[PDB]
Amino acid sequence: NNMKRMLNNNNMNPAGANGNINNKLQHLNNMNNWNTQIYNYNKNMEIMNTMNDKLINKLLYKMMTLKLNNMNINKIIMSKTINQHSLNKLNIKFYYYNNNNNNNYYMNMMNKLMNIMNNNMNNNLCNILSYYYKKKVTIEPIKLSYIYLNSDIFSKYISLNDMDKYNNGILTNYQRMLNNIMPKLNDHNISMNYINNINNINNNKYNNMINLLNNNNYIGNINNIYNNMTIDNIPMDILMYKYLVGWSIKFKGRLSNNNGRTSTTNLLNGTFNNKKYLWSNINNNYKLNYIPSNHNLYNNSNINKNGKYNIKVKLNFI
Amino acid sequence: STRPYPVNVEAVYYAPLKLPIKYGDLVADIQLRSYDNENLDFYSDFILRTGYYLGIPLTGPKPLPTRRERWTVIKSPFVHAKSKENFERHTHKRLIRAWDTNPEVLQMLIAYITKHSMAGVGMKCNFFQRSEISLDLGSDANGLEKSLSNIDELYSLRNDDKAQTSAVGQKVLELLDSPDFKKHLE
Amino acid sequence: ISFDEYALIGGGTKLKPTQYTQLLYMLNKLHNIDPQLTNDEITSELSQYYKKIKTLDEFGRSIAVGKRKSSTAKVFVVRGTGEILVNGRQLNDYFLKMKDRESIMYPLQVIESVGKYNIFATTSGGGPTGQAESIMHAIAKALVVFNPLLKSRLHKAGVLTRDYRHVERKKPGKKKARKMPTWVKR
Amino acid sequence: SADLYMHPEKWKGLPPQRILELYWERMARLGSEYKPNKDELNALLTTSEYSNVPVNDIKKLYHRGEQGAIDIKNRDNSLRPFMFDELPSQAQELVAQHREQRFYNRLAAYELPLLAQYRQEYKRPSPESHPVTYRYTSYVGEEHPNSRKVVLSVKTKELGLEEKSLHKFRILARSRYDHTTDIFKMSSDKFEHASQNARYLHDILQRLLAESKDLTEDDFSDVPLDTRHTIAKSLRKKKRDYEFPEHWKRPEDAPKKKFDIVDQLLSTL
Amino acid sequence: SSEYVLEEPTPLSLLEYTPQVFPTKESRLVNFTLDSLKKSNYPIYRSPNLGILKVHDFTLNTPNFGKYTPGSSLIFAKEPQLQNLLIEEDPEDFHRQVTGEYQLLKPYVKKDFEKLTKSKDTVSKLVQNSQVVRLSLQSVVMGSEEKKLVYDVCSGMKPISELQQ
Amino acid sequence: QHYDESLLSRYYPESLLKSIKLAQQTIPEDTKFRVSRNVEFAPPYLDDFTKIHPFWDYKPGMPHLHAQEENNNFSIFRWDQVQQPLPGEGNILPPGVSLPKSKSADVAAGLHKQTGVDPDYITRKLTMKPLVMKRVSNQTGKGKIASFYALVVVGDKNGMVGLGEGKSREEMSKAIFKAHWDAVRNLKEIPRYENRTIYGDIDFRYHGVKLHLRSAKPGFGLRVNHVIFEICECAGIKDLSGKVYKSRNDMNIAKGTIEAFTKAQKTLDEVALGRGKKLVDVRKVYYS
Amino acid sequence: GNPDILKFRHLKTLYPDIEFVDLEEQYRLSMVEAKKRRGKGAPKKMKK
RNA sequence: GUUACAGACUUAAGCAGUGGAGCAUGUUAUUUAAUUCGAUAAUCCACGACUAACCUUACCAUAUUUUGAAUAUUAUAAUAAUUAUAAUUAUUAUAUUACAGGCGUUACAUUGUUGUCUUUAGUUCGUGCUGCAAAGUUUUAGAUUAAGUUCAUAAACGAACAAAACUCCAUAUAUAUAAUUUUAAUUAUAUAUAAUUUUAUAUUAUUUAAUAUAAAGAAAGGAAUUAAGACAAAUCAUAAUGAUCCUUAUAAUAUGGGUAAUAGACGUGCUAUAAUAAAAUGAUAAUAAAAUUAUAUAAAAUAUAUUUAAUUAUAUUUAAUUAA
Ligand SMILES: [Mg+2]
Ligand SMILES: [Mg+2]
Ligand SMILES: [Mg+2]
Ligand SMILES: [Mg+2]
Ligand SMILES: [Mg+2]
Ligand SMILES: [Mg+2]
Ligand SMILES: [Mg+2]
Ligand SMILES: [Mg+2]
Ligand SMILES: [Mg+2]
Ligand SMILES: [Mg+2]
Ligand SMILES: [Mg+2]
Ligand SMILES: [Mg+2]
Ligand SMILES: [Mg+2]
Ligand SMILES: [Mg+2]
Ligand SMILES: [Mg+2]
Ligand SMILES: [Mg+2]
Ligand SMILES: [Mg+2]
Ligand SMILES: [Mg+2]
Ligand SMILES: [Mg+2]
Ligand SMILES: [Mg+2]
Ligand SMILES: [Mg+2]
Ligand SMILES: [Mg+2]
Ligand SMILES: [Mg+2]
Ligand SMILES: [Mg+2]
Ligand SMILES: [Mg+2]
């Protein structure tokens, strides 16, 4: 009875079995729903800060496109920035995409731009930002190797770069490429496997606790509780979102040279329901109380010769 | 498995320790506001840990009631005023209270907290100074000199074994040391 | 094992209720074989398909907290001769409506124990009728501790049920909860 | 040293990777104010055996950056199929959170014990000598205009006064003196800085004390204590003054200690 | 995959992060010094200017930075180095912050009012008015000289014309 | 658990030893250590934090929140490659997956899965030809819903031929793909005299279309309706005369003509077997 | 807001090395050029 | 203007209203120098507009601005910061064109968003199969659910978007925390668990499903989410953009006026037409919740209206707190 009581007191684990919690690798922090991660007691000041942040975003967007002697215009796509306002310091951060060992000996335009953000001793952009906020700023770029890992980047890139493929109409090859980005992953199978792995982990911890046990609720040493639990085994299995299960991309507006009317054209793949939440302890949560956590929706509206159009993107991520 | 995990690691893995309160001489209370929980709770836990280790009997995250700033808005850009949408914002509030500490230790704690602060969390501190009734700022120069000596004692490099150093702090110390600074008052 | 549990090893989405019922029938009959005559093989095949008390205080009174609408009623019920004190004053002085008093009495009236138990009620929040109802609710819970055999009877009477009836919020377009503003087909 | 990139003359004897790193640093630090160097070029030529590049080609690249590279030498690979070697946005955010957590755990483990060096036992000022409590407020990251607010607060009986003088002091205080709790407090927000405000409050207190101790042709023996503000405050708040009747208690009806024999057997200490 | 280089925490590293308002006398001096450094435009919250970059040594802290009424655009004035940098460190500011010294204005005496106006009752009224003004102006925050000017104007010792300048 | 200094030094580095000692001094031996259920400070796996991980901790030289470095110093001056690649095994492949004219190859592959047909043959020897390419519509409550209809003869040019039709609401390429798929599913060995023409003069009715297809002397080409010609090219018929009466509905011609080929024809050998007689071809005997 | 905020003009001042492109401005210029071409350019402003 | 079920605030009961009165507000019409512009069947009419004195405003009268709010190009000159009396840069000034600017016109060029059908149960995908085919099957013999949701039967098998569920509020329980003076522990807030409730006896219809009874439970709601398509539904007056038109004027500033005009008409409301209903009074101050207070919330108290005083309204003057 004492042993049972001790177990009950210590019974905690990663959520997702059928005494458990959602770990920081199993769900998003609701702070990562907003883009200006701040609280100030004077709300005027907070408003001023969020205005500043918004203005800096525009500036960053402007910077992102370079030129090379009027030969090549490499348009680096960037995500919407997320500004982390700690008491000590601001930290701006964004995800970005850029399209033999010969380039160890010259600085690329993108590289130069990235260096400008933090490395130029006095001249750097972070230093200049610090005057607007009255605290040390740190811009961290994060490179994405694919166009479709971030939703904003995906939508933005298609808006800016791939004009010719959809201006008159969506070219067949381009559409095919869009369709067959991902390899049609059995999302049901993956979610179920993840759940099984979580169950196994829980059993392992429980087994260890039992082994230790053979009015105070202290078990044995840490090494014996977490016997088989390590950095190599657990973290990557527990990591929640990893697999772009399903995605929808919508082109809309005057994307027809002959026609006067508009054209809604939608590409759909995979699924947008998550089966990890359907049969387990882990529950779905809503970002800004209206977007299922796993979803991420975005649009970007480039102007054409004919007028305005936009490109919705929506990915699922198991 | 012949791998000695020392006590600090164990403490990290378990809940944070709290020192008992000898006397109810509330020295400082620290309120933590944020627009969500997960970061805030973590930060509070971290504050408790630092308070305990080289610490001042901190009580713990007493949740003060959350606010609710509501705002309603017509969904459309034009007319359809029968359809309206709500919006809300919850200011989550937690209280820490330090109970018995010599001011310097409390300052250090607070300074440490603000150094390794988290993203979403704002902070406010109410410090309390139990002073005597009658006071005097007449015997001045000597008191200034004493204060400077105390500062010097506080910020002395004991052993330069690649310790944490600050350029601005060094500059401040140099300014405090200077003859010009001493002259200021008289 | 459950239907869903069986599906994961069995058919999955293609598993039907009738199939599951058949499987259960097959297992149950096998299990029913007199334990002495059973085999090892059978048991191996079947292996797959397996898988606080309330008391009185130091001073002999049962505390209980009841709620209704916005009201909350913490009530100390004790074995002394049946007198009432609502919120630090006489019952007729607090609850002017006789209906509220009758409601309060009802837990003691379903039992033959009005007059047996002294009751010290302490209410907060809501209005008078809701407060009285919360007190009643608390009293029933308090009584339940004195004799657990009457608990079922109290539940049947409808006193042990927490009355959930919660005030509906004003929705945007509507004037009150349900009351919409006038329609006009013209 | 740290300041190494700035001097291209020194680094010829270093390994090739290190030389490359220094070159990259140099390019970074002075971005627009970059100006080529002979020693640096020589180093870069020496490194060339590391990463497969000819001697003329490296020199050409050094002279002309991206244009040179182009001259030395593409298909769009934006929607190339997923090779499963990079986490998505949400995933990456979750990882970052986990990194942060780990960092904080590390801090808790190895820096907070170090912090316990700087540890002092409490040196209490006695309530007899130190009755007044100047509370200061500070908003950390922000610059609130309430940071200037300082609040003095004292129990009036703890002040060194005779009984007549105490009454006079209380009368002078008016709304500031509460009578239920024998406490007099006052806050000042008039001045720019907090210290100023505290000083002003102190000066006021001193003036109040001086007035209390006067007694020359001004006693205030026959002005009763005005307690209207306090009763108004009490009305605004709620009260839970009532208690369980002491004669209603039944210690005899309370649950007696039930005899647990196995527990008794166990307790051999 | 490398060893954690533990840099030891120190009071010196936690200097700057000390609360701007803390009761202690020692802390007050430090806070004042920090404020003076900030006023001087010392590299706090930012990387310093040394003798490495020559052309691009820019700053934004000019006499009227985040302000509209002075007609200009963003002015990129060159920063000094860490050497050749002055610190303002004014006495009045020190008096305000470190000690708790305050001006309180001066109460206008009746004799001064008699100098201008003749009748006694009128003088007394003017004195009363000046007294009323004084306490209000003490309560308000504006500026040492400007506030005094306003007080004088309200009294009638100076005319209305001295404000509009 | 309070360990000795020497033991700690053996397993832990020299920097953290002092911190460990301090922790031991501060925290007593008799300690309870509660389990915080409502918030988790530490990770779900055991880790002595002495070793900084490449992926799971922050990259040292990279700037971020919680940098703990100077504004000048950030050791990260190339942004071409990714900073923190994935740990241990480079991939994050699920269980049972693999890493990676074209349309025709995809069709062939799909056929091989569904019906065990040789993909290489489908890719190379079979050659397709669209016969009809309608846009077609249905009046739904939603509205008029258009649909692209294809009808596509495929055929190895050695008497192996198949017709196929396909349909897609999405653009015609998909419909054509479906038609091609259908055609390869329905491959059919037509009989033909001398590997160039039909045996007899056939006269066949398929629904509306009345077909008439005469045999032809060698060299005399395909002299028939364009649909018939297309089908013959794919099916390896070099020589053919003929004429369509009544309906000339392209689809029904295409369906009717392959039916006529498979059904109306009798090979000489089959006829000989049925009757019990020799059935010589005089020209062949002569040697032209 | 804060009127002294970084603009595209400055992104040339701070970083001359990087040949930046303001996209909206470029678009506007292209539109203006198109207007000039097809006889829909702005009329020349009166001075007097 | 059809067959037969099913549907609900559809109807029927029922309770309170509108419609009559006066006022408020929106609309119309007409007026006006201007009564700015749009919304105008359900799906406009206290709607856009969560406050029209000036402003806001877009309208009108009279005045006066003309590279103007931007970006770039080309020149003269002046001031300030930095360096070791010169120079580099940053700015400002005067001009110089391209232009800037436009609540001007077209949501029948667009974006995004929204209304109605709609929390309605539909909408598709491969693929397979039937029909020469458009198409059909899937998506239904048979029933049922709130339901394309679930049983069965079926040339179908799955699927995606919908439905449901996860979500939020509220509830019950547990744990943690709060030195029970920031206390309301009768609380607040993080983390769990809990139900789309379960079990059994009977009575009708065919192993199940509805009724009833019983015993076990705190166990009973609301919110968000409103698919595809359609209505060339609404918006160029949130904002942006295409085309087009204005460029000493259709752009910009000030002073006043207007948006508040009034024959009839139309919605929404408010106050009424008195005794199952109105008014005075009720200080050991009968009983709430939710939310706001550094572009503030303003307590006590004095004075006048007012011979006592209370009430109510102002003035006098700011105690306390930027807040469990
Ligand atoms: Mg009705
Ligand atoms: Mg009427
Ligand atoms: Mg009426
Ligand atoms: Mg219009
Ligand atoms: Mg109108
Ligand atoms: Mg106009
Ligand atoms: Mg224009
Ligand atoms: Mg506009
Ligand atoms: Mg339209
Ligand atoms: Mg639209
Ligand atoms: Mg067919
Ligand atoms: Mg159907
Ligand atoms: Mg159908
Ligand atoms: Mg739903
Ligand atoms: Mg209490
Ligand atoms: Mg719809
Ligand atoms: Mg229309
Ligand atoms: Mg219209
Ligand atoms: Mg427009
Ligand atoms: Mg005009
Ligand atoms: Mg005007
Ligand atoms: Mg109006
Ligand atoms: Mg209305
Ligand atoms: Mg009446
Ligand atoms: Mg009052």
Q: Do the beta carbons of residue C175 and residue C183 sit within 8 Å?
A: no
- One-letter amino acid at E25 equals K
Nearest to B129 by CA among B113, B107, B96, B109: B107
What is d(CA E31, CA E98) in angstroms, rounded to the nearest whole number?
A: 8
Nearest chain D CA: its distance from F25 CA (Å): 9
Rg from Cα positions in chain C = 28
Neighbour tally for B40: CB within 10 Å: 25
Residue A68 is classified by DSSP as: B
Test F42 with B3 for CB contact under 8 angstroms.
Answer: no
Confirm whether any atom of chain H, the nucleic acid strand, is less than 7 Å from CB of A37.
no
Single-letter residue type at D96: A
How far apart CA C183 and CA C69 sit, in angstroms, is 32
- Alpha-carbon span D5 to A119, nearest angstrom: 13
Resolution (angstroms) equals 3.8
- Cα distance from F170 to chain D (closest Cα, Å)? 21
**Alpha-carbon distance C178 to C181, whole Å?**
10
The letter for the amino acid at E46 is: R
Cα→Cα distances E118→E108, E154, F213, Å: 17, 19, 137
Q: Are A103 and F65 in contact (CB under 8 A)?
A: no
Q: Chains contacting A with at least 3 CB pairs below 8 Å?
A: B, D, E, F, G
SS3 category, A259: coil
Give which of A87, B92, D107, A216 is closest to F42, Cα–Cα. D107
Residue F118 tokens read as 């040789």
- Map chain E to HEC letters: CEECCCCCCCHHHHCCCCCCCCCCHHHHHHHHHHHHHHHHCCCCCCCCCCCCCCCCCEECCCCCCCCCCCCCCCCCEECCCCCCCCCCCCHHHHHHHCCCCCCCCCCCCHHHHHHHCCCHHHHHHHHHHHHHHHHHHHHCCCCHHHHHHHHHHHHCCCCHHHCCC
Report the distance separating Cα A93 and Cα F66, nearest Å.
Answer: 13
Nucleotides of H under 7 A from a protein CB: 38-39, 41-50, 66-68, 70-72, 80-84, 88-93, 96-101, 109-116, 123-129, 132-136, 151-152, 157-162, 164-168, 170-179, 181-193, 215-225, 228-230, 232, 234-235, 237-248, 266-269, 285-292, 294-295, 299-301, 317-324
Six-digit token pair at F238? 């070099």
Q: Are B172 and E34 in contact (CB under 8 A)?
A: yes
Residues 6 or more apart whose CB falls under 8 angstroms from that of F167 comprise F136, F147, F148, F149, F150, F175, F178
Q: How far is F7 from chain A (nearest CA, A)?
A: 16
Tell me the C-alpha distance between E17 and E11, whole Å: 10
**Rounded Cα distance, B151 and A290, in Å:** 54
Cβ atoms of A31 and B119 within 8 Å: the answer is yes
What's the A186 CA to ligand 9 centre distance in angstroms?
41
Interface test with G, best of E58, E60, E74, E76 (most G CBs within 10 A): E74
For E50-59, give one letter per residue: b (16+ CB within 10 A) or e.
eebbeebbbb
Q: Are A244 and D82 in contact (CB under 8 A)?
A: yes
Q: How far apart are CA F117 and CA F109, in angstroms?
A: 9
Least Cα distance to D149 among F102, A293, F25, B124 occurs for: B124
Backbone angles phi, psi at C71, to 5 degrees: -70, 150
Please state at what angle helix F250-259 crosses helix F226-235, rounded to 10 degrees.
Answer: 40
Cβ atoms F122, F107 nearer than 8 A: yes
Query: CA E88, E93, E97, E100 torsion: positive or negative?
Result: positive
Residue of G18, G17, A106, F83 lying closest to D23 (CA atoms): A106
Residue A185, CB-side half-sphere exposure with 13 Å CA sphere: 30
Q: Is D86 on the interface with F (CB under 8 A)?
A: yes
- Residue E133 CA neighbour count, 13 Å, CB half: 21
Phi, psi of D208 (to 5 degrees): -60, -45
Residue B163: φ, ψ to 5°: -80, 170
CA distance F176 to F152: 7
Return d(Cα A304, Cα G5) in angstroms, integer.
30
CB-CB contact of F250 with F132 (8 Å): yes
Q: Which residues pair with A312 in a beta bridge?
A: A250
> With contact defined as beta carbons under 8 Å apart, do C69 and C100 qualify?
no
Å between CA of F258 and C1' of H198:
68
Nearest residue to B129 via CA among B43, B17, B38, B25: B25
DSSP calls for A80-101: PPEEEE-SS-EEEEEEEE---T
Strands C118-124 and C84-86: parallel
Answer whether G touches B (≥3 Cβ pairs < 8 Å): no
Q: How far is the CA of A217 from the C1' of H224 (A)?
A: 42
> Which amino acid appears at position F16 of this protein?
L
Verify if strand H has an atom below 7 Å from the CB of C179.
no
DSSP assignment letter at F197: B
Which residue has tokens 């003509």? F257
Cβ atoms D149, D141 nearer than 8 A: no
Cβ of residue E57 lies below 7 Å from strand H? yes
Q: How was this structure determined?
A: cryo-EM
Q: How far is CA G38 from CA A218, A303, G25, G28, in A?
A: 85, 20, 20, 16
Q: What are phi and psi of E36, to 5 degrees?
A: -60, -45
CB-side exposure of E42: number of CA atoms within 13 Å?
A: 22
Buried/exposed code over E89-102 (b: 16+ C-beta within 10 A; e: otherwise): beeeebbbbbbbbb
Q: What is the DSSP letter of E3?
A: E
SS3 labels along F121-185: HHHHCEEEEEEEEEEEEEECCCCEEEEEEEEEEEEECCCEEECCEEEECCCHHHHHHHHHHHHHH
| D242–C57 CB contact, under 8 Å | no
Question: Is D249 in contact with C56 (CB distance < 8 Å)?
Answer: no
Is residue G6's beta carbon less than 7 angstroms from any atom in nucleic acid strand H?
no
Q: Interior CA angle at A33 toward A27 and A38, to 5°?
A: 115
Question: Taking the mean position of all CA atoms in its chain, how far away is CA D63?
Answer: 51
Q: Would the CA dihedral through A43, A49, A52, A56 be positive or negative?
A: negative
Spatial separation of the C-alpha atoms in residues B15 and B34, rounded to whole Å: 22
User: What is the spatial distance between Cα D132 and Cα D127, in angstroms, rounded to a whole number?
Assistant: 9
D34 contacts on G by Cβ (under 8 Å): 17
Any strand H atom closer than 7 Å to A279 CB? no
Of A48, A63, A303, the CB nearest to G20: A63
Please tell me the total number of residues recorded for chain E in this structure. 165
Q: Name C77's bridge partners.
A: C62, C119
Contact by Cβ (8 Å): E17, A88: yes
Look up residue C120 and give its DSSP letter: E
CA dist., res. F118 & res. F114, Å (int) = 11
All residues of chain A having their beta carbon less than 8 Å from the beta carbon of residue B13 are: 222
- For D23, other C-beta atoms within 10 Å of its C-beta total 24
Neighbours of D216 (CB within 10 A): 6
- Determine the residue of chain E that is closest to B105 in CA distance: E11
End-to-end CA distance of chain G: 38
Is the minimum distance from the CB of C181 to strand H below 7 Å?
yes
Q: Which chains have 3 or more CB–CB distances shorter than 8 Å to chain F? A: A, B, D, E
**Cα(F260)–Cα(F210) distance, integer angstroms:** 11
**Is chain B in touch with chain E: ≥3 Cβ pairs within 8 A?**
yes
Whole-number Å distance between alpha carbons of F217 and F240: 9
Query: What is the distance between the alpha carbons of residues A17 and C127, in angstroms, rounded to a whole number?
Result: 45
Q: For residue A87, give the nearest of B10, B37, B114 by CB distance.
A: B114
Residue of G nearest to E65 (CA): G4
Q: Which chain A residues touch G14 with a CB distance below 8 Å? A: 123, 125, 128
Interface touch B13/A222, C-beta < 8 Å: yes
Residues 27-66 of B with CB under 7 A from strand H: 29, 31, 37-38, 41, 59-66
Strands C71-78 and C84-86: unpaired
Report chain B residues touching chain E, CB-CB < 8 A: 103-104, 107-108, 110-112, 114-115, 125, 127-129, 137, 140, 143-144, 147-148, 150-151, 154-155, 157, 161-173, 175-176, 180-181, 184-185
Contact of A282 with A22, CB cutoff 8 Å: yes
Chain A neighbors of B90, CB-CB under 8 A? none
The C-alpha R_g of chain A, in whole angstroms, comes to 24
**Which H/E stretch holds residue B13?**
helix B7-13
In chain A, alpha helices (H): 2-10, 43-64, 109-118, 125-133, 151-160, 163-166, 172-179, 187-213, 222-225, 234-238
F29: closest CA of chain A, how far (Å): 13
- In the structure encoding, which two tokens stand for residue C173, read together? 């377009």
